[PDB]
Design a protein around this ligand. Structure first.
Ligand SMILES: NCc1ccc(C(=O)N[C@H]2Cc3cccc(C(=O)O)c3O[B-]2(O)O)cc1
Ligand SMILES: [Zn+2]
Ligand SMILES: [Zn+2]
Length: 219
């Protein structure tokens, strides 16, 4: 798979297909974090920003240069820093920051600028030719965590709800609901029965197996 790094190695993008890339940044907490870059005919769309504004700026600038179009939209998958840390950069550049109402409320509570709160339990978006579904499966990693589905590729962005193979514990559970997290995972497995790739919030891209791994970690 084609991989491209910033001048520092702190930012990397890896191609999943012609129009879909994973973006990965190193923040301190040293912790890598994943999101998605969608190359569409109407502009770039990101799933999740990054740890802070410095990295988010760098990310945007890298993909805008490479793909020769603007970042127009970002989907924020919950209100923690690795997801929403760059929200100030998005707002001041006129980049639309989509989220559930709950994610927006929690962002505000925690002193972040507010994303749009436009996403429902199920929301279907289209950016040029690129179809994007957002789904709130229930509480897990956080009370507000959502997943993102690309039905044209059967690619699932699990976010921090979904642990990577390298993860040997549930990680940061300060704001988690460990009794509901299994049901929420099961809700994802029920909705998306045929998955080609699953992108975890941290770690290597996997498949449906990452969902099953997460269930085992919850026992
Ligand atoms: N409510 C206090 C609080 C604020 C922010 C964070 C936070 O930014 N957590 C992120 C960074 C991180 C650091 C280490 C592991 C994970 C993980 O996904 O498990 C991980 O993902 B989080 O979204 O929880 C946690 C608690
Ligand atoms: Zn989190
Ligand atoms: Zn996380």
């Amino acid at each position: 798979k084609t991989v491209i790094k910033n001048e520092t190695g702190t930012i990397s993008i890896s191609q999943l297909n012609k129009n879909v890339w994973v973006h990965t940044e190193l923040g301190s907490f040293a912790v890598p974090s994943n999101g998605l870059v969608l190359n569409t005919s109407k502009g770039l769309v990101l799933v999740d920003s990054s740890w802070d504004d410095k990295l988010t700026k760098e990310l945007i600038e890298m993909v805008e240069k490479k793909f020769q179009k603007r970042v127009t939209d970002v989907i924020i998958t919950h209100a923690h820093a690795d997801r929403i840390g760059g929200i100030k950069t998005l707002k001041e550049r006129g980049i639309k920051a989509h989220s559930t109402a709950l994610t927006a409320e929690l962002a505000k509570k925690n002193g972040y600028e507010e994303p749009l709160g436009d996403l429902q339990t199920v929301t279907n978006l289209k950016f040029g030719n690129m179809k994007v579904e957002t789904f709130y499966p229930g509480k897990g990693h956080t009370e507000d965590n959502i997943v993102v589905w690309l039905p044209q590729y059967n690619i699932l962005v699990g976010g921090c709800l979904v642990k990577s193979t390298s993860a040997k514990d549930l990680g940061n559970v300060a704001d988690a609901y460990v009794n509901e997290w299994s049901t929420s995972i099961e809700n994802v497995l029920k909705r998306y029965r045929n998955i080609n790739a699953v992108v975890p919030g941290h770690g290597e891209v996997g498949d449906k197996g990452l969902l099953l791994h997460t269930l085992d970690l919850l026992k």
